[PDB]
Each structure stands twice: as structure tokens, then as C-alpha cells.
Design a protein around this ligand. Structure first.
Ligand SMILES: Nc1ncnc2c1ncn2[C@@H]1O[C@H](COP(=O)(O)OP(=O)(O)NP(=O)(O)O)[C@@H](O)[C@H]1O
Ligand SMILES: [Mg+2]
Ligand SMILES: [Mg+2]
Lengths: 181, 684, 317
């Protein structure tokens, strides 16, 4: 359990993209080592052997171990994840972390408390930088549903243009102008 | 015409111009079509004159050469234009078909048809067969003879296309229809041997399977109990039981018929004898005894058939259970030009769907090895729906004619309709088809949300909400709507999606489908479709409609909890739509659909004229309102008014955006929604 | 009940018409109209009799008695009935609602046979009665007001806002006047003086009165022809003076805290006695006596279970 944090705390020592990939791999392997389900504790050895089995099973073992970890330990792992997100722009690690965020948003347990407002800013930004333009649109619409803001409306217009749908951009602009100046 | 219109002083001038264009290029289909259509429009204008003067026979006879002077060349030009085009030619063919049906007593039209129908390809006549078998050998020999000739001609090329429609038609009660069916079917058996007989066997077996003796007696004894116990109509009760008693007397043919006779028929015969003794002796105690017996039989059958789940074909149809490689096209097929799929076999039993109504889920394996699923059902008039699907095909073709609607894939989702005789038939089962009401229930149940919360809020404020005034209802309704968040379907749209991209695409297709269906619903006369009849696709998210009901502008006649607006966009739908709501994509789609309708208003008017004109279907419009033929003419006039922007501002010309905005503002009328039936759950 | 002048008649959806002293809040007796909700109430100038209009009933009771037993009693048309009214001479009662046919039912009758019928537009939302024996105002769902002569079915049609339905219309004393409010609620006032013939004349457009209304519910007059009042579908009532038709005061039942907001719509208004007091009500089951030109709420009556609506009251004995 706590071992999973020890690799996670390694996020405070990674700089290069290969270093962050190694961090994700080692965290995946240790998550597999002490998974609640024996079907993953058995696959720990194979994940060490191959590598991509650690990637595929990273979400599954992460969910169970994070569930077992208490509030402080969960917050520590979350801070490690936030260091990874705010440190370097890596499509693979960022997309994997965004997938974790998506599952936790969908799952009844609630989203990861990655930062303030669940990192809906950062997540959206990352979804724009990893070219997941629809993902960034979803995060920007989560911001929108709290209330219309000129920055939010302009960001939606930009994302709609980025999604090659001028119709949505025009409609968003019309809504913005009718609602406010 | 754009400077003058069509009238007596303008017809020959424009006809001369079109004829000159034809002479300069006789190979140009557009000029021939223009000349024929101008002659048809002249026929319509002189018909307007005929109705203006005759309604205030001599005028009709006087115009019987003026109208022929355009009708005969209209018919001939339509024939030549049809010979010069394919696919869209059916439109021109329809322009012929309705026209001479209205003028099917003049001999010149008969000569023109008899010589000109041979300029049409028979494969395109195949698309006309239903409206031929509706009018074959009716009391108008100049029409009936030609229709019989046409159907016999069709039989020489594609008899399989005629076997099913004529097999259904032969069960019509009319003597002439039955006998004409016999003649054409013999002329077909000259080519196909006994495939007519095989199809008749299959149809009869399916008809018997669709409704058991248990179910026929269930309905009949419910009516008998109502009449004797409710109305005290002894004579009506005996009238209802008379054919039912006759069926029981005739004896069984299958294991469930025999089982019914063993279980219920033995007692039902005693009740029958008591009724017979009353009707010659006056023993009302015998009526009470027979009625109580019928009551017990009815309750026993009602308790017997929630188990009607697995219907074994052995006990209702040994013939069909031992189905073999019958050279019969699979129902729902076929393209004549292609490798027609023959029926290999069917599953040993049927799955019945549990509801107030009990369709049978039939599974069939054809020559290509594929499975085809169908919904057999009785007590159901499917000709209406078949015409509605033809109209959907019309609209889909119109959208396919627009490059905007080709790059933006707009189309109405279609499915099979296969009527059988005696108000029954095979509908067709569509996979991944989910009721919107059931989807909201799914979300609420998975999150432990009570389903009737909105209605409970309404009734807490007003336990007697129904008998309130308009503003009282609006107060209670708006308070309840403010006290709820009708956004379940948006959450399910997000949750059921695997990824953000699929969610985005499904939302786009969803909104486009909503816009297209709302506009088509207003124009074609949508109305009576509760959320139960409103279905969703699991893959595309596009909306489907299974019940068509009275949606021909007559469902608007309702007064007991209407149906005040032909169409509706609910709060739940807008909540699942984009951030823009109406703005952007939805309004653009509505404008595009209305533009397609306006531009091709002539085709839509002709097809709706075809539907409204046919007496067999037109007689069913007397269930609602009004001189039936005059109301039919009025309905076509209102169709033109909607297709010319004259529905909200009759004494004006509504532009496309003007009419769209007026329709939107009608749909925003929450005051109408408070009055409407709660089946359309108004809080969503 | 009818023997005490300051009694106010109140009723809601809960099938009970209560009678309570205006200046004290003390309820005296009740009446039962279990057929349907109240669409309208009225206290006769005849001194005395009760009317209550609801779905398929004009229930008429004996206002003087401590038990107001039924009078005629209707048991009216088979459609929703909205309005009421008693003539000042002990003459016919007037019934509206759907269908487009105004029914006339005598007070002295003891059966369901109608005495006269008048032609109207879309179902009647309101009826009001002049002291004149040959004038009667009706407001319809079509946005059209209709005068008729009470004797000959000679009528005048008025439509001040055709696309906006009219809900309440009333008179002023000194006979021939008219005021009305509609689905926008921007009140209109005309002078009807005067004449009977093939058309009942003459409408004289006097003024338009801007009530703070998004949908108006009821507008009524003062016995002394000094005041008018109107009620909005949102949370307010308003008062003007007849001499200049300029805004005197207002009642705002919408608290500053959003938690108590949308307590109910302001159903019904009229004045009682001197030009100082006014009776109104809300659908939160609160019938209210407050002041003219002052806005001070004096008495509040929470004696009902379901949505008080369209008050009526006595003024004298
Ligand atoms: N193409 C279809 N695909 C899937 N389910 C269908 C389809 N058509 C009908 N149903 C389902 O079976 C039920 C409808 O049965 P049905 O007897 O056709 O209704 P109905 O009341 O008879 N319609 P109508 O007679 O026109 O008013 C519903 O529960 C549907 O979910
Ligand atoms: Mg049916
Ligand atoms: Mg059906």
C-alpha cells in the first residue's frame, strides 16, 4: 500500500520525459504488486517482464490501491499525480492520467481531487495540448455549466473552430452576445 | 409565370414556350417535364374553375375537352418524360396515377393510358402495386380494366412481387377484389405453379398464430360481459358471441385450439346453449348463468396468458414448424434485380412481448443464411403506416437531393412494414431501440430516484390539478418545473459514451435528428406520439418513431387532453442538446429542412395528394372530423399553405426563417403544455 | 355571515369558502362546494347571497345564514365555468366559461332551465355588471371585451390587444365605465357612456394604465369611484386613483430573501368601505387586508389548505 506512494513521491525527482515514463511504469508495477485483487498480484511479475501490461493494468490496480489508501495517502498520491501533470507535457502519461480522471468522474466514487475545481482548468488545458479537443470541450463545458463567462464563451468558440465545426462556434457567439455585451 | 402566375391568359403562352424548348432539344428531359407539368397545372387551374362554377355537371362536360386538351397531353408528356428518366420518374408516374384516377371516366384518357403505359419500365410499376390493388375492378370499369391489365402484365415479369400483395388482397371481403385476385393469381400460377398456394398457406398460418382462440375469446368475452353486464345489451352480446360461437362450433385445427376446447370450450358451449335458450324462451336466469360462466372463462384466460412468452409453433402451426426451402421472398425484401433471398426455415418457437398488446417475435433463416426478426401482430391497421414509410422515403430522397443534406447526413430512420389481411401483419424488429421514457427510468432507478417526483410535486401543490383554470395550472406547473432538474438524458448521453469523441459525434447526430424530425413532424402532421413511442439508438443516438397513429393533421382534432401543437421540443431534449440550444446547429438544420420542403413543395403535395385521395385510406379520416372529399381537398390546401408559408400568416408569405421562428415560438407555449395529456410528461 | 358588513369571502382549491372579518382575522363560518375548485367568488349587491364558480358549477348559497345552503343550485354546463356576478336589482345571475356561450340563470328560479343566452368569443374569463339595467361587461380568452344589453342580445365588441387574452374586466361607479387587464396585464380604461340600440354604445378610450404585470390576474374597482387595483402573476398588487389613473401605491409580498420567494401568485383584488383599505389574496393560502396609498399590511388570514384564489367580500348590510 504505502510502497505505491514511494514511487509516487518519485515524481518529485523526474524531469525528462523518459524519466516520467519510468516513473509511471514503476508506479504501475508497485500498484500491481499490492493490488487487492489476486489476479493483479499474480500479473505483477508479467508486468515487470514485458512493460505494456503495466500500462494496460495501471488504471485497474490504481483504482483498487487508491481505494484502499486513506485520505492522507490518497492526497499524497494525488499530489504526485499533480506534479506529473504540471511538470512536463507528455502525451502518454498525461493521457493516462486524464483517463484516470475520466473514470473517476464517471464512477460513483467521485473525481480525483487533482487540484482546485478538480483541475478542470488544467485538465482542459492538457486536453487541448494532447489534441483531445473534444475532451477539452467537455472540461470547458463543465466550466460553462457553472455560469457564462466571456473567457469561457471565447474558449468554446476557439475549441469549436479547432473541432472544424463552425456551426457550434457561431451559435456559441450568438448566445454570448444575447446574454451579455 | 414568375411575373404572371398560372391562369387562362398565361397557360397557352408558356406552353408554346415550353414546346419550342422541346423542339430545340427533344432529348432534354427537363423541357419535356416542364411541358407535361404545365399541362397538369393547366388541368388543375381549369379544375379550380370547374369546382368554382359547378359547386355554385354541365360545366364539367364543357371542360371535358378543355381539360382533355391539357390532360391528354399532360398524360402523354408524363409518359415520355418517365421513359426519359429513372428513379425520380416515379414522381412523374405519380403525377399520372392520381390524375387519371380523378379523370378515369373520359375515353381519351383511357386511350392515352392504354398506348402510353407501355413506355414505362415494369420495374418502376412495381413501386405502384398497392394503389393498383386498392382500385382493381372497382365500380369504374375504365379504371379497373386497365389496372387488371397492368397487374397481369406485372405478373409476367416479377410474379413474386405480386404474390404477397395479392395474397393479402384476396382476403378482402369485396367480391370483385377477391375474384380479380383469383384471376391474376391464376395468370401468375401459369409461371410460378403453387407458390401462390404456399404464400396463402403461410399467410393463413401466420394469421391464426397471431391471435389464439384464447385471445379471440378474451376480447369477445370482455365485450360480451360489457354489453350484458354494463350496457345490458343482451342482443348485442349475442351478436358479439355469434361468430365466436361459430368458430368454437367449427372445431379445432391445432393443439392449442383443442386444448382451449378441452379447458374452456366445453363450458362455453353450455353458456352458448343457455344464451340460445334465452333468445327463444326469455330465461334471464340462464343469461346470468352464461354470463357468470363467461366471466370465469375470461378471468381464467387472463390469468393463463402472462405465460404467453414461449409460443411453440407445433401447437399453433405444424405446417410452419416443418417449413422447408419454399421459393418465397423473405418478408421485408426484395430488390427484383438482385439475388432474392428465399426462406429456408424458422425457429421452433416464438417469443411474445408482454404488454397490453401481445406481438409475436418471429425469427426466420433465409437462403443466404442470415437471420431476420419480425413482430407479428393483430388488431392493427398497417396500410396507414406503410404509406407513412413511403412518405419517409420521399423525404429521405429529397434530402439526398440536397448537397447540404448529403455532406450533413440528414435522413429519417426507416424500417419494415408488412401488412397482412384482417388488420394484422408483420412490422419488423429494430435492434438497439430504447424507449426514452425507459431511459429516464433507467437513470433514476440506478441512482435510486423516485420516478413520479415531478408529478408528486404537482399533486402536492394541487391534488385536483386537472379541473383548474389555465393560469392555475400554469402556476402549479411552473412551480413544479422550477422544483426539478429534467436533465437525465444528457447525463446518460455522457455516461453511456465510451469516450469524449463518440459522445460528441452522438450529440451532433442527436441534435440533427431532433431538428429534422421536428420539422418533418410539423409539415407532415405529427401529433399523437407519447414518449413511449419515441425511441433512441444506442449507437448513433438518432431518434426513431414506432407509432404513427393519426398523424395526418387530424390528430390535432383532439379535445380531451390534446395535442395542441403538432410537434414539441421538451426541456430534457434541450438539456441534452449543445450549449447553443437552438442557436447554431439546430436552427441551421431546421432552416435547411424547410428550404428543401419549400423548393420541392410540388412533390410533397403530390404524394400527400396520393395518400389523401385514395378512398380506402381517406375513409379513415372521418374518425376525427368532416363531405369527406371536400375536407380532403381542404387538407391538401392546408398542406400547400404550410409549404408556401401560409400557416401562421395565411394572408401573407412566410419566409423560411420567419416560419421557423414562429414554429419555435409556438413550441415555447408552456400554457399549451399545461393543458396537454400527462402521457407527454410535461415536466421533462 | 351576511349580517356582518366587514366579512370577507375567501376560497381556494380545497373545496371550502370561508368567511372572516376583514379587520380582525376572525373566521365565522364556511361553505362547501366539493364539485371542484374555485374559479371565482362573488358577494351580491342584493344583500345577500354567495356565488362560487368552478368546473361545471355555479354554486349559489345563502350569505345571510350561518349555514349557506344551496340556492338554485348549479350544476351548470358540462365544461369549465370561470366567472360569476349578481345584478344590483335582484335580477339574473350571469355565467361564463367554456363554450362560447354566456348563460343567464335567474336568482328566483329553482331548476336548471336557463332564462337567456348571449353570444361571446373564446371562453369567458370574467363578467362584471353595471348598475344600469341594460349594460354588462365580459372579458374573454380571445383578448376581446364584449358589452351586451341585458334585454335584447344587442352587443358591442372591443379588442384592445387581439393577440393577448383578457382575464379581468370591471366597471367604475356612476354606471358606464370599463377597465380591463390581459395576458400582458397593461391595464386599459374606457368610458362607456352611453346608449342602447342595435349596437350598445359608446366606448370612449380614456387611458392606458401601466400595471407592473407580466400576466395580470384580477382588476377591480372601489364602491366610491376613487380607486382602481390590479394584480400581477408575479408577486405584486398595485393601486391607482380613478381621478387621474396615476399610481397610488403597491403591495410586494416578495421577501428580500430568495428562500421565501415565489410564495404564490397574487390572486384577486378589490376595495372595501372608505378609500383607505383593500382586500387581496395569494396562492400561499393568505388572504390580506392592507391599506390604500400606504402599503401597510394590516391583516393576514392563513385559513385555507390549497391555493386561495379570486376573493369576494361584503361592504354593507
Ligand atoms: N420496430 C420495433 N422495434 C422494437 N420494438 C418495437 C417496435 N415496434 C413496436 N415495438 C415494441 O413493442 C411494443 C409496441 O407494441 P404495439 O402493439 O405495436 O403498440 P400499439 O399500441 O399497438 N401501437 P398502435 O396500435 O399504432 O397505437 C412496444 O413495447 C415497443 O417497444
Ligand atoms: Mg392496434
Ligand atoms: Mg403494432
Amino acid at each position: 500500500s504505502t510502497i505505491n506512494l514511494q514511487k509516487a513521491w518519485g515524481a518529485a525527482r523526474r524531469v525528462s520525459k523518459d524519466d516520467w515514463l519510468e516513473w509511471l511504469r514503476r508506479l504501475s508495477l508497485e500498484l500491481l504488486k499490492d493490488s487487492s485483487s489476486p489476479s493483479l498480484r499474480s500479473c505483477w511479475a508479467l508486468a515487470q517482464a514485458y512493460n505494456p501490461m503495466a500500462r494496460d493494468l495501471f488504471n485497474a490496480a490504481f483504482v483498487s490501491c487508491w481505494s484502499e489508501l486513506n485520505e492522507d495517502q490518497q492526497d499524497e498520491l494525488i499530489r504526485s499525480i499533480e506534479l506529473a501533470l504540471t511538470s512536463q507535457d507528455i502525451a502518454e502519461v498525461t493521457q493516462t492520467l486524464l483517463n484516470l480522471a475520466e473514470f473517476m468522474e464517471h464512477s460513483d466514487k467521485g473525481p480525483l481531487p487533482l487540484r482546485d475545481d478538480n483541475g478542470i482548468v488544467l485538465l482542459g488545458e492538457r486536453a487541448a495540448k494532447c489534441r483531445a479537443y473534444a475532451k477539452a470541450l467537455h472540461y470547458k463545458e463543465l466550466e460553462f455549466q457553472k455560469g457564462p463567462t466571456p473567457a469561457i464563451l471565447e474558449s468554446l468558440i476557439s475549441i469549436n473552430n479547432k473541432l472544424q465545426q463552425p456551426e457550434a462556434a457561431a451559435g456559441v457567439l450568438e448566445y454570448a452576445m444575447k446574454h451579455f455585451g | 409565370l414568375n411575373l404572371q402566375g398560372i391562369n387562362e391568359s398565361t397557360i397557352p403562352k408558356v406552353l408554346q414556350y415550353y414546346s419550342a424548348a422541346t423542339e430545340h432539344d427533344r432529348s432534354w428531359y427537363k423541357a419535356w417535364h416542364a411541358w407535361a407539368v404545365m399541362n397538369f397545372e393547366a388541368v388543375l387551374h381549369y379544375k379550380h374553375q370547374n369546382q368554382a362554377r359547378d359547386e355554385k355537371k354541365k360545366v364539367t362536360e364543357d371542360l371535358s375537352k378543355t381539360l382533355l386538351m391539357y390532360t391528354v397531353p399532360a398524360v402523354q408528356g408524363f409518359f415520355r418524360s418517365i421513359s426519359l428518366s429513372r428513379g425520380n420518374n416515379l414522381q412523374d408516374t405519380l403525377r399520372v396515377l392520381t390524375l387519371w384516377f380523378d379523370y378515369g371516366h373520359w375515353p381519351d384518357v383511357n386511350e392515352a393510358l392504354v398506348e402510353g403505359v407501355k413506355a414505362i419500365q415494369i420495374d418502376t410499376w412495381l413501386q405502384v402495386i398497392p394503389q393498383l390493388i386498392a382500385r382493381i375492378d372497382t365500380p369504374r370499369p375504365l379504371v379497373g380494366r386497365l389496372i387488371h391489365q397492368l397487374l397481369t402484365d406485372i405478373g409476367r415479369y416479377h410474379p413474386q412481387a405480386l404474390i404477397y400483395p395479392l395474397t393479402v388482397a384476396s382476403k378482402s371481403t369485396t367480391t370483385a377484389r377477391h375474384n380479380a385476385a383469383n384471376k391474376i393469381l391464376k395468370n401468375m400460377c401459369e409461371h410460378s405453379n403453387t407458390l401462390v398456394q404456399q404464400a396463402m398457406m403461410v399467410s393463413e398460418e401466420l394469421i391464426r398464430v397471431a391471435i389464439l382462440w384464447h385471445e379471440m375469446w378474451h376480447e369477445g368475452l370482455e365485450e360480451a360481459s360489457r354489453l350484458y353486464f354494463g350496457e345490458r345489451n343482451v342482443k348485442g352480446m349475442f351478436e358479439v358471441l355469434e361468430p365466436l360461437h361459430a368458430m368454437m362450433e367449427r372445431g379445432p385445427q391445432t393443439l392449442k385450439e383443442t386444448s382451449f376446447n378441452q379447458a374452456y370450450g366445453r363450458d362455453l358451449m353450455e353458456a352458448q346453449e343457455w344464451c340460445r335458450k334465452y333468445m327463444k324462451s326469455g330465461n334471464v336466469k340462464d343469461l346470468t348463468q352464461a354470463w357468470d360462466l363467461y366471466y370465469h372463462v375470461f378471468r381464467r384466460i387472463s390469468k393463463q396468458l402472462p405465460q404467453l412468452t414461449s409460443l411453440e409453433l407445433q401447437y399453433v402451426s405444424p405446417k410452419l414448424l416443418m417449413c422447408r426451402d419454399l421459393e418465397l421472398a423473405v418478408p421485408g425484401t426484395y430488390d427484383p434485380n438482385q439475388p432474392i433471398i428465399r426462406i429456408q426455415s424458422i425457429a421452433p418457437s416464438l417469443q411474445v412481448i408482454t404488454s397490453k398488446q401481445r406481438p409475436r417475435k418471429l425469427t426466420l433463416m433465409g437462403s443466404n443464411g442470415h437471420e431476420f426478426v419480425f413482430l407479428l401482430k393483430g388488431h392493427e391497421d398497417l396500410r396507414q403506416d406503410e404509406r407513412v414509410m413511403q412518405l419517409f422515403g420521399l423525404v429521405n430522397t429529397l434530402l439526398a437531393n440536397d448537397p447540404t443534406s448529403l455532406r450533413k447526413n440528414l435522413s429519417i430512420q426507416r424500417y419494415a412494414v408488412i401488412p397482412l389481411s384482417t388488420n394484422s401483419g408483420l412490422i419488423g424488429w429494430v435492434p438497439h431501440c430504447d424507449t426514452l421514457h425507459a431511459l429516464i427510468r433507467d437513470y433514476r432507478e440506478k441512482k435510486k430516484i423516485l420516478l413520479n417526483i415531478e408529478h408528486r410535486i404537482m399533486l402536492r401543490m394541487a391534488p385536483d390539478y386537472d379541473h383548474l383554470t389555465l393560469m392555475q395550472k400554469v402556476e402549479v406547473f411552473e412551480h413544479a418545473v422550477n422544483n426539478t432538474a429534467g436533465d437525465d438524458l444528457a447525463k446518460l448521453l455522457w455516461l453511456k459514451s465510451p469516450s469524449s469523441e463518440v459522445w460528441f459525434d452522438r450529440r451532433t447526430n442527436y441534435t440533427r435528428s431532433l431538428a429534422v424530425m421536428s420539422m418533418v413532424g410539423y409539415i407532415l402532421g405529427l401529433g399523437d406520439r407519447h414518449p413511449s413511442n419515441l425511441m433512441l439508438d444506442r449507437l448513433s443516438g438518432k431518434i426513431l418513431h414506432i407509432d404513427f397513429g393519426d398523424c395526418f393533421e387530424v390528430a390535432m382534432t383532439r379535445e380531451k387532453f390534446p395535442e395542441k401543437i403538432p410537434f414539441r421540443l421538451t426541456r430534457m431534449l434541450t438539456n441534452a442538446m449543445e450549449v447553443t440550444g437552438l442557436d447554431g446547429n439546430y436552427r441551421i438544420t431546421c432552416h435547411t429542412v424547410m428550404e428543401v420542403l419549400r423548393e420541392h413543395k410540388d412533390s410533397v403535395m403530390a404524394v400527400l395528394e396520393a395518400f389523401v385521395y385514395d378512398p380506402l385510406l381517406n375513409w379513415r379520416l372521418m374518425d376525427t372530423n368532416t363531405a369527406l372529399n371536400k375536407k380532403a381537398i381542404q387538407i391538401i390546401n392546408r398542406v400547400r399553405d404550410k409549404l408556401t408559408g401560409r400557416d401562421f400568416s395565411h394572408d401573407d408569405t412566410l419566409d423560411v426563417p420567419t416560419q421557423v421562428e414562429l414554429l419555435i415560438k409556438q413550441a415555447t407555449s408552456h400554457e399549451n403544455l399545461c393543458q396537454c395529456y400527462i402521457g407527454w410528461c410535461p415536466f421533462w | 355571515v351576511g349580517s356582518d358588513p366587514v366579512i370577507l369571502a375567501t376560497a381556494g382549491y380545497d373545496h371550502t369558502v370561508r368567511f372572516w372579518q376583514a379587520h380582525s382575522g376572525i373566521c365565522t363560518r364556511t361553505v362547501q362546494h366539493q364539485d371542484s375548485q374555485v374559479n371565482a367568488l362573488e358577494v351580491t349587491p342584493d344583500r345577500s347571497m354567495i356565488a362560487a364558480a368552478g368546473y361545471q358549477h355555479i354554486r349559489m348559497y345563502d350569505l345571510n345564514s350561518n349555514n349557506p345552503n344551496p340556492i338554485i343550485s348549479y350544476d351548470g354546463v358540462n365544461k369549465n365555468i370561470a366567472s360569476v356576478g349578481f345584478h344590483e336589482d335582484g335580477r339574473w345571475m350571469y355565467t361564463g366559461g367554456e363554450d362560447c356561450t354566456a348563460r343567464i340563470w335567474d336568482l328566483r328560479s329553482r331548476n336548471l332551465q336557463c332564462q337567456r343566452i348571449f353570444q361571446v368569443n373564446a371562453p369567458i374569463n370574467c363578467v362584471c355588471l353595471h348598475p344600469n339595467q341594460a349594460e354588462l361587461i365580459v372579458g374573454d380568452q380571445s383578448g376581446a371585451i364584449h358589452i351586451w344589453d341585458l334585454k335584447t342580445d344587442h352587443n358591442e365588441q372591443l379588442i384592445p390587444e387581439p393577440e393577448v387574452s383578457i382575464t379581468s374586466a370591471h366597471i367604475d361607479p356612476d354606471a358606464s365605465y370599463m377597465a380591463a387587464v390581459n395576458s400582458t396585464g397593461n391595464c386599459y380604461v374606457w368610458n362607456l357612456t352611453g346608449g342602447i340600440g342595435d349596437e350598445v354604445t359608446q366606448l370612449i378610450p380614456k387611458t392606458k394604465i401601466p400595471a407592473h404585470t407580466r400576466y395580470a390576474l384580477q382588476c377591480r374597482f372601489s364602491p366610491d369611484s376613487t380607486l382602481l387595483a390590479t394584480c400581477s402573476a408575479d408577486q405584486t398588487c398595485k393601486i391607482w386613483r380613478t381621478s387621474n389613473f396615476s399610481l397610488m401605491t403597491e403591495l410586494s409580498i416578495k421577501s428580500g430573501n430568495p428562500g421565501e420567494s415565489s410564495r404564490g401568485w397574487m390572486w384577486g383584488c378589490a376595495f372595501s368601505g372608505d378609500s383607505q383599505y383593500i382586500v387581496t389574496a395569494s396562492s400561499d393560502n393568505l388572504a390580506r387586508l392592507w391599506c390604500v396609498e400606504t402599503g401597510e399590511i394590516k391583516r393576514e388570514y392563513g385559513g385555507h389548505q390549497k391555493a386561495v384564489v379570486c376573493l369576494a367580500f361584503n361592504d354593507s348590510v
